[PDB]
Every structure is written in C-alpha cells, then in structure tokens.
Design a binder for these strands. Structure first.
Ligand SMILES: O=C1c2c(O)ccc(O)c2C(=O)c2c(NCCNCCO)ccc(NCCNCCO)c21
Ligand SMILES: O=C1c2c(O)ccc(O)c2C(=O)c2c(NCCNCCO)ccc(NCCNCCO)c21
Ligand SMILES: [Mg+2]
Ligand SMILES: [Mg+2]
Ligand SMILES: [Mg+2]
Ligand SMILES: [Mg+2]
Ligand SMILES: [Mg+2]
Ligand SMILES: [Mg+2]
Lengths: 663, 666
DNA sequence: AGCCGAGC
DNA sequence: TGCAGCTCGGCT
DNA sequence: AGCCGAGC
DNA sequence: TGCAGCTCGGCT
C-alpha cells in the first residue's frame, strides 16, 4: 500500500496469499509486457513490480546500506517478509502476502546477474524459503516459459556463496579459470527445474565472464570492447568537424552493434577525450567543450548533449589506416563491426593506463611516458634491452619514486616560503583540487571533533589546469610540521601499488603481468610481426596496382596508335580481343580475391579524356611512379616501416603538446 | 538569517546580515549559467553575490490558483532566499530591513526564451511587490571567457527602470489572462510594421515592447502551423532531414533527432524534437490520419493518449511510403530553401498534393492566438480536389478520424457532436464499444466508470475486453437503474458524447501572414490556388530541365556516332585543341549546367563518358535514351498542370489503399 | 570508507 | 533506466 | 480545473 | 534541463 509502480495482486494479503505470485521485472518495460500478458484475468493471483538497475549485494553489505536500500525494502514490504524470521514450518508462511516470487529479466547476461542478486538476497536472509521453492523465473505456452528454482542440497548453498561473497574472490578466480580453459578446449573442437548450483555454474558464470570481457582491456591496443567500438566508429566516420558526444554515441551503437544503454557509451567517449592531469597521457579524442577538470576529477563534465568531440590528429598516427587491412574484424548478425583488436605502433595500454573491475579479477595500470616508450621500442629494434620505466603522468610536476616492486611514492609539491607560509603547487596524481581542499585544508583550518587546527589561513590561486595553495601557519606549528615531514603532514604523498596488471593477451587469454617490461615485450614481438604482414601486404597490393596501371597505360597507347580499336565492337568481341592480346583481368581485384570471367572494367571505365595528350602523359607518369613506389617499399624492412611511423608520431606529438602549452 | 534546505543556492557571504541590501542574488537560466557565474565571481565575488539556478519556465503568478502558487518550488525558493513576504509594502527604508538581498540580477540566454523567463520573473515581482520595482530591485546581466565577463561586469549590467503607469500596463499586457485581445492587437501591429520594413537603464515598457514581443512572435512562428503544408518549423525540419537522409531502414528516434539538429540547424533542446518525431509517427485512433513517419516500436496507444510511448532511445522510425507521394521530390526544385548561417536548411514550406493541414488536424498554442483543426478524410479531400479541377464545387466536409467507429454530426458551422458507441445487450447489461475521439480508455475508466461503480453508485460491475487499438466495456446494472439511464439517454449518462468546436483556425498563409480562416472550405480553396499554380511552375521547370537533358543527350549521342565513324578523333589531341574543335563543330557547352545557371565552354559531360560508350551495346543504349528523353519532354509539353496533379493524386490513392489494407491485416 | 568505470 | 512542471489560448 | 504540444 | 544507486576487486 502506497508504493509507486506496484500493481499489487487482488488476492494478495488474504486467504489465498500463498497462491499469489509477485513478478519482479527488469525495468518498467518488462513490467508493462507482464501487465499486458497478465490481466484482466491474471490480476488476482499475480502482482507486478519493476526493479531499475542492479540491486544491492546484501550478503556482506553494511547495516546502513541494507536499511536504506529502496529496492530491498519495497520487496520486503510487498511480500510481507521479516528479517530473522525462519520459515521452517507451514504455519509461519501465513504472514506472507505472496507465496511465490517470479523473477523476469532480459534473456541476457546482465539479466542473469539480477536473477542472481535476487536469489542471493533471499538465500541470505531466508534460506528456509528456498527449500519450499519460493523462487521461479520467466524465460522469454505461458507455462512452458515458467521455470522453477529448486534447492537440492548444500552444494547449492556453496554455489550461491561462491558467486556473491566477498570472501570467495580466490574461488571465483579458479571458477572462471576452469570455465575459460574449458571453453578454449571446446573452441578447438565443438561447442522445468533448475538447481541453484546449475544456475550459478551454467548461467551466472556467463555474466561473470562477459563482465571480464567488457571491463578488462586487451594488452594489444589497451582497449575494452566498448572503447574499441568508439574508435572503430570514429575511424569510419572520418569526421572533419566536431560531433555532439550524444550523437557520436548513437552512431557507435548503429555502426558497431553496441547492445547496451547509451549513457554508458557517452561516459566512455568522455573518458577517452579527457586530458587533465591524471587522466590520459594521450587522448585519442578531442575534448571540445567542458569534459571535466582536475578540480573535480572530471565529475564536472557537462552533459554529453552539449559537448563535442573528434579524433585527435595523433589517433591515425598511432593506429595507421594501412594496418586495418591486417585486423580481424568481428561480426554481429552478418554486420561487420570492430576488430578483435587494433595494433597501435606503441603499447597504448601503458600510455593511458588501464582501469577495470570484473569478476575474479581487476586491472590497474598507471600512465607511462609516450617518449620513453618510443625510445625503448627503438632500443628493442636495435637488439638492445629496454630500460626500466617508472610511471609518468603528462604535466604532473611532482615525483614518482620506486619503493619496492610495483609500488611507488607519488608526491606533490610543497615549499616553505617564510616562517609563516607554505605554498602547495602540485597535488599527487588523482588527488583532485576540490577534494584536497575540502578533506585536507578545511579540517586543517577548522579542526574537527577528532583533530586540532594546524593552519591559520589558506588562499587559492588555481587555474583550470594547475594548483596553487598559499597556507599561513604560526611559526610554532610550521616548525612542528617540518619536523614531522611537510609532505606527510599535508597529505601530499600517496602510494601506488600495481600488483593487479591483468590483461587479455593477443590470443584472448586472461593473464597476470608481473612487470610492465613483460607487457612491453609481448606487445613488441606482436607488433614487429605485424609490420612484417604490413610489408607483405603492401608489396602485393602495390604490385597489383603497378600491373593495373601497366595494362591501362598499354591500352591507351595501343589505342592512340591505332593498334587497337573498340569503336562499335560488341562487348564479347571486345573481351575476347583483349584476352587474345594478353591484357590481364583486373589485377587489384584478382589480388584481393586471392587474399580469401575476365574483368576489363578498370580499362574500359576510363573516361574519353584518357585518350588526350595531357592525360596520356599523366597516365605514363603515374605508371612509372607506382613502379618506383613498389621498389621503394621493397627496400624497406619491417623495422624501417616501424621507425618511419614512430618518427611521424613524435613529430606530431611535439607539435600537439607544444600547442597545448600555448592554447 | 541563513538558508537551510536549498541545495543549489550559493548564498552571498553577507546576505542576511548588516550588508544585506548591498547584496545581489543572481538568478540564472539553468545550472550551466550558474557555474559560469560562480566562476566569474571567483573568490572576491562570493561576498556580495549569491547565485541560484532556475530550471525551466516558471509559474505565471498573476491569476494563478492559490494552490499552484503555494506548492511551486521556484517562487517559494526565491521568496525564502530573499526573505520576501506576501502582502508587505516595501515603500520606505524601514520595510527594506527584512530582506537578505537588496537586488536580483537576472541572467538568461540572450535569446527569445531567455527574454520570456526575464519577463516572468519581472511579472512575479510586479504582481506581489510593485513597491520593490520603484526602488530598482531588478537588474539583468547580458567557457573560460566567464572570468573575463565579470571583471567587465558593469558594461554587461542593465538596470530595469520603473517610469510610470505605462510600465504597469506593459507588464499587464504581456502576462494577464484578461488581456488576450490586447495581445492580438499588440502582435498584429508588430507584424505589420515588420512587414513594411522589408519594403544602461531599461524601462519595463521598453522591455515588453521591444524585447519580450520578439519572444511572443517567435512563439507563434514555432507553434502555429502553415496552411500550405500543415507543418510548424520543427516538424518541417524533421521531414526535410528525413528526405535528405532517405533512410531505407529504421533509425532510432533519438539518433534521428540529433541528425535533424545537425542538418537543419535546430537550435533547441533535443527532447522537444524527439517528442515531435514521436508525435508525427503516431497512428492510434485520434492521432494522425496519415502518419508521415512509421511507428516502429511502442509510440503510445489510445489507452493513455500516447503518453505510454517508450523512450526515444528504444524506438525506431523511418519515412512512410506515402510521404514522398504526398510531397513529391520534383517539387523540391520550386521551394524557397532557408539559410541558417551559410548552411542551407528546410524550406519556408513544402507544397503537398493535398492540404495536409486538414488531414492530420494541425494544432498549437502561441501568444495572442492558438490553432485547432480536426482531422479530415484523405479520400474525401482528394475527391474535392478532383471536383475543383473539373470546375465543380467542392462538397462540404465533416471531420473524420481514421478507424473511429463512432459518429461525428454537424450541429452548425465549425460545431460538432462526437459520439462513442453504447448498446443495450440485455436488461442488465450495456456494452460500450467506442469512445468519442480523444477520450482515452484509461481516463474514461478512471473518471467515468469508476465513479459510477462508487461515489450515488449507478452501475453494479464492469469488465474490460480492450485491445491495444479497440475499446470494449461490458457494464452490469439493475433493470431499474438501466431503465432510468436509457430514459435519460445512454450516451448522455455514460458521457459518450463530447462537442468539438473549431472557431480558432489560425494559420500562417503562403506569404507568412497570420490569418484566421472561418471554414475549412476557405482553407481548401486558398491551398488549391497555390498548389495549382505550383503544378504550373513544375511543368515550366520540368520542360526546361528535360529539354536541357534532351540537348545534353543529343550532343553525347552525336559525339559517339561521329567517333565510331571516323568523323572525329580525340586520340593524342591537346586539351586546348580539343575544346576549340568541339566548339567549331558546334557541340554545346553542358546544356544542363547552362540551364541551371540561367535561373569557357564545358564539354566534360561528353569527355567524362567511359570508353564503354564506343561499344556496340552502349551506342544503341545511348540512342534509345536520347529518343526516350525526347519523347518525355514532348509528352510533358502536351499535358496540363491539372493532368499532372491528377497523376499524383491517383498514385497517392493507390498506395494509400495498399498501406491501409496492410495495416488492417497486420 | 570510498575511488576507479562499464554495465543495469 | 525513469523521475520532476511550467507557458501560452480555446475550450470544456 | 485540465487537455493539447513546442519550448525551457 | 538535471535528479536518483548499485556491482565487481584492489587498494588507500
Ligand atoms: O537504475 C539506473 C539505471 C539503469 O537501470 C539503467 C541505465 C542507467 O543509466 C541507470 C542509471 O543511470 C541510474 C542512475 N544514475 C545516476 C547517476 N550515476 C551514474 C550513472 O551512469 C541512478 C539510479 C539508478 N537506479 C536506482 C536504483 N538503485 C539500485 C540499488 O538497489 C539508475
Ligand atoms: O526544467 C525542465 C526542463 C528544461 O529546463 C529543459 C528541457 C526539458 O526537457 C525540461 C523538462 O523536461 C522538465 C521536466 N520534464 C518532465 C517531463 N514532462 C514534460 C515533457 O518534457 C520537468 C520539470 C522541469 N523543470 C522543473 C520544474 N520547473 C517548472 C517551474 O515551475 C523540466
Ligand atoms: Mg539487457
Ligand atoms: Mg584512463
Ligand atoms: Mg536558449
Ligand atoms: Mg496530430
Ligand atoms: Mg488556463
Ligand atoms: Mg565493495
């Protein structure tokens, strides 16, 4: 009574309570379809209530969080449940307004996750209810869609616990390892009641796995699938002017078959464009408009509906168009979409870091310096070993120092000005300006219930991209602060631990990398061999292009010398004639064909202009130029090709970063 | 005093204190403006300046209900932040001592809707505290640019001045429900004067008469449809975009909106455009007789009046096959396309083959005027057009709603009774099978049947057997109560009869003048003369163009024939010599290009032909094409504009039959 | 205790 | 993912 | 006491 | 136009 969006069952709460089913739906739309297929007749024994968004995992949630959750509370009230009340006997079930809950989600992995979270909720508070068979599901003949969950022993308790307990992270790792190894095996070969154990190990695990596939980036290009689709869509559009972020998101959805809510995409586009300190070392997309600042960690970005973006000039230098011919492009229902990965010229995964949380594993990598990485790549091309690399954030004025393995001290900047004054001109990476102010300087100024005041005043002189705090203290307090350690006292040192460098390798296998050098080496070997493929590809293609022009130059000359005439000949006479004179069928088309009647259209589609003087000359020059182009390319090694790309990238990186310091 | 529960307020440091009157509350249009203001004020500004954002148009408090006024978030917030009190005169300097701020600075977009918000705020103060206006309570303010604007603030700062009773009358003219007539005259003079011209302190009177009036006029320009195509500009931009796009598969509505925004220079929030798209696509009883866009997905139903439409990111649309039959592509060449800053956008109007303004029943609300037209039958209209083409008189027309099973009877000029369907089944039972047009099923249940069942109850039970597109109530009652109901009249008792009155058919005519039309027959005639005239233009245009195409093909065939015969050669000839030779032999510079311009010699249309052109099959194919084009121009010259119109009408009716048949099956 | 971000 | 209210005129 | 819809 | 909360793992 008095709950929004609840369509309570007529007989709910009465004598026929335990004959009533509450349908919990995934969102209002599923609630509407349930309402349509239910009433008028089904209105007596069936209630409907929509849930919007993932629900609280209650199993180890705090008391406050549980007591305040809107969704859990609404279910408790609607059903008549009570905490701590066992439902062991058949007389205690009389207090319930509903006898069954039917879960109705999308028939997809996120749907399974909500099912799971609802199951987890009941199993945690009222396992007794699971033994009577309290939960059903509606899969999308209305009784043939109804499937009953069935508790059948402690192995069902163990499966729900494995999936939803914070204490079972290690077990989930093993769990998913078995799943990933098994599905890898089957890839080389081939391919009414439901226990909770079968749901967890045969359905939920599909979500848990997809969670990893969408949240943990690839080593090769540093992208997750959604990010990859964004770049793919952008490369394809080739926008020469800015696009609304919201419009770009719709375009990605269309062109790359992204099957998810678009606000996620818009947020991802924003993340790819951000360029403040502690975000992207190299943003592949331009933040045209307010995309967020270091004042609020980007949380001050404007709506995707009022900000614009387009490719950075660095994007195609980093992911050259020509390499597209070597990628494996995926398919979504007979539409070709994004590749399994791009193959950038430097390991992008290190340049911009890597943040991802999945199931069993999570990924964290800090930023690394683009020029250092270029230099180490050049070293490895020379046969030398790469230098060790420290994390490095563009425009960060502080220090990052190694403490141990995969652990670092990140320090901002504080200098004593006089005996009453310190100045803070840099905050440690990922410490935001507004947050430092509210959580450090204010308490330092005002004291708290648990800490005394330490400073007498502070003044702000920040810009949008820099930090300047001028802080006043008594001489006494400044002296004490110095003895204690200025950086320490002012919370300007944080540590950075990187013991979860978890990525998908090029084969699609999840792996833990112990050092960044390992990531660099695996990337290097792969990228070097792709320059080999690129060269082979270019030799063939340029070659076919050369053969093409040869046949075209040959026909024009034979034509303007009267050695051949096409005037008023039938198509078949013409084709037989050209064959008999040894003209090759379209070499370029032939060559693309090999990469998986005679065609002389590349000749006869030429304009009449071709026969004129300037056009004969111009055609001969092009033929000769392509011939030299074939030989210039044969002279270049994979390493040469890579070195050209690196040089072009650094040149533009310098121009672009120089212009940022001006702009 | 401090202010506790107003989350988005940034109170001036000195507001509510000794220096209250020296503080300014900046009221902004939206949160974005607030942020820019907060940046502009820096840290210095925080002391004498408060910022509070308003989101959306605010309540017109003049003549508003007491309830509305008491429950409104924005005006109650403004009242709390400033410390105002209803019914208190702020004449002397004593009375001013209970205020937390001395002045309000309004900061809106420098566009028409901004002016409207300023005016509503001004209206709010003028209505409750006229005394405050005399003191100069109200002022206004005209990226990274933000911190710069505020250091030069004084130039951007305008003060409103109260100068006499003419200031009271201007505000009252704009915002009083009692001054609709004066607003009509106000805008009429404005529109007239504007038509002719084509041939530090700011008094309120000048704000109303020189700034707000521009909003009122824009309000009509966007809300009141054109007679010619039955569109308002937002709708027109959508259609224009769809034609340009020419989608062969469904596009998400939200994506379409973004596309319209881009291609047609739509300068407003996209949610309004997505709603317009949904509106153009709807096809439940009482919406469109001919939906130009297809409702692929849940676009709403008669159950809730379309308000049950799914979100625009989960629904799809595309052109109806009928759209280009109604708005033929060839006629695009006769339209005046508009420019928005170098970009070519939608036309001033489209010119459909029947008066679309009557088919889907245009409706809108502006300032001074509003528009309502009911739906009319497409075939009846086609038939009246045919009648007028033969010099006959058009039959009078009754409103007609596609798939409406009830009755529309004419009481008199522009006056109609619209009735649903109710019939006695037995002596305990009536059945309701149609609701009057625009009575929605759920609403009828809630406001009619529910009361009858409950609170002096009249019926005993009722059951529902609706479908998505049909209505069926079966109603149970005692013989005694049914006999009474049936005596008083079943349609009357069950409220299945509504009146439809149409005394405000206001539309922009073809010249962009607002006009009131008294009958649909007037609308139909004025449309008819324009459209017939445009079949004239289309014929002229087509004869010119097809002629140029004929010439073009003549020269091309000629070159080809001459080439395959030896009479001419281009092999190894200089470009310069080749041009000169073609000239000497009297080949014509691109006839099509030349014709288009007419509204050195260019022989590219000859020389860009492929070598394939010289081959046997292509030579015959070219001769065929040349002849056919010649026949096409001759065939068109013989025809009258009426003939062309009749061809389009017949094509339209044939597809309308197919489409509507397939709907009743599907 | 709360951030990180790609989903609902 | 869905939630939140107002203008303006004619009409009921 | 509220619908209709193109705006904020 | 802006408003609302949760998952999952590592780590502060
Ligand atoms: O449910 C969504 C939601 C969704 O179901 C599908 C797509 C979405 O984008 C949302 C959603 O955004 C959402 C809320 N958004 C608040 C802003 N936080 C970051 C959103 O990306 C804020 C709240 C919210 N749902 C509230 C229910 N909370 C679940 C806890 O039991 C949602
Ligand atoms: O302010 C908007 C708004 C806007 O400023 C710009 C664009 C918008 O689409 C809105 C807006 O939709 C809005 C509200 N929408 C509720 C859905 N019903 C109306 C259909 O858009 C519901 C409330 C709302 N504003 C809050 C209430 N302000 C009215 C003053 O009494 C707005
Ligand atoms: Mg789903
Ligand atoms: Mg990043
Ligand atoms: Mg505006
Ligand atoms: Mg309509
Ligand atoms: Mg009113
Ligand atoms: Mg946690």
């Amino acid at each position: 009574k008095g709950i929004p969006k609840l369509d309570d069952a007529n007989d709910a709460g009465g004598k026929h309570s335990l004959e009533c089913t509450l349908i919990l739906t995934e969102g209002d739309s599923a609630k509407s379809l349930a309402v349509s297929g239910l009433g008028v007749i089904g209105r007596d024994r069936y209630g409907v209530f929509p849930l919007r968004g993932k629900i609280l995992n209650v199993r180890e949630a705090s008391h406050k969080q549980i007591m305040e959750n809107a969704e859990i509370n609404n279910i408790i009230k609607i059903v008549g449940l009570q905490y701590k009340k066992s439902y062991d006997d058949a007389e205690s079930l009389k207090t319930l307004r509903y006898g069954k809950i039917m879960i109705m989600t999308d028939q997809d992995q996120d749907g399974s996750h909500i099912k799971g979270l609802l199951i987890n909720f009941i199993h945690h508070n009222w396992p007794s209810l699971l033994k009577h068979g309290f939960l059903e599901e509606f899969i999308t003949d209305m009784e043939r869609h109804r499937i009953l969950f069935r508790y059948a022993g402690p192995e069902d308790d163990a499966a729900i616990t494995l999936a939803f307990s914070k204490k079972k992270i290690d077990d989930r790792k093993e769990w998913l390892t078995n799943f990933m190894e098994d599905r890898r095996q089957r890839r080389l070969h081939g391919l009414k009641h439901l226990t909770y154990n079968d749901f967890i190990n045969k359905e939920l695990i599909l979500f848990s796995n997809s969670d990893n596939e969408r949240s943990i980036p690839s080593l090769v290009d540093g992208f997750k699938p959604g990010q990859r689709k964004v770049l793919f869509t952008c490369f394809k559009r080739n926008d020469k002017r800015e696009v609304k972020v919201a419009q770009l998101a719709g375009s990605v959805a269309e062109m790359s078959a992204y099957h998810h809510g678009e606000q996620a995409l818009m947020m991802t586009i924003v993340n790819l464009a951000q360029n403040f300190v502690g975000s992207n070392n190299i943003n592949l997309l331009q933040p045209i408009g307010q995309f967020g600042t270091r004042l609020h960690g980007g949380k001050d970005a404007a709506s995707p509906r009022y900000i614009f973006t387009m490719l950075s000039t660095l994007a195609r230098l980093l992911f050259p168009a020509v390499d597209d011919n070597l990628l494996k492009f995926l398919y979504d229902d007979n539409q070709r979409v994004e590749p399994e990965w791009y193959i950038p010229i430097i390991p992008m995964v290190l340049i911009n870091g890597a943040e991802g949380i999945g199931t069993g594993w999570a990924c964290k990598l800090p930023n690394y310096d683009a020029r250092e990485i270029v230099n180490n790549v050049r070293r490895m091309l020379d046969g030398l070993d790469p230098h060790p690399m420290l994390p490095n954030y563009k425009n960060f004025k502080g220090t990052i120092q190694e403490l141990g393995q995969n652990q670092y001290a990140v320090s901002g900047e504080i200098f004593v000005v006089d005996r009453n004054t310190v100045e803070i001109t840099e905050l440690p990476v990922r410490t935001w300006t507004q947050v430092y102010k509210e959580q450090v300087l204010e308490p330092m100024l005002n004291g708290t219930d648990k800490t005394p005041a330490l400073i007498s005043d502070y003044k702000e002189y920040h810009t949008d991209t820099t930090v300047k705090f001028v802080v006043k203290m008594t001489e006494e307090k400044l002296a004490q602060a110095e003895a204690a350690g200025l950086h320490k006292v002012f919370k300007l040192q944080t540590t950075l631990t990187c013991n979860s460098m978890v990525l998908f390798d090029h084969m699609g296998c999840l792996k833990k990398y112990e050092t960044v050098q390992d990531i660099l080496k695996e990337f290097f070997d792969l990228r070097l061999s792709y320059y080999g493929l690129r060269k082979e590809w270019l030799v063939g293609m340029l070659g076919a292009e050369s053969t093409k022009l040869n046949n075209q130059a040959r026909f024009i000359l034979e034509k303007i010398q009267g050695k051949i005439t096409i005037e008023n000949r039938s198509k078949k006479d013409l084709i037989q004639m050209l064959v008999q004179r040894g003209y090759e069928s379209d070499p370029v088309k032939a060559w693309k064909e090999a990469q998986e009647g005679p065609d002389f259209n590349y000749i006869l589609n030429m304009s009449l202009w071709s026969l004129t003087k300037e056009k004969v000359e111009e055609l001969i020059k092009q033929r000769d130029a392509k011939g030299r182009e074939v030989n210039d390319l044969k002279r270049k090694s994979p390493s040469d090709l890579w070195k050209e790309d690196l040089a072009a990238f650094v040149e533009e990186l310098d121009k672009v970063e120089s212009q940022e310091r001006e702009d």
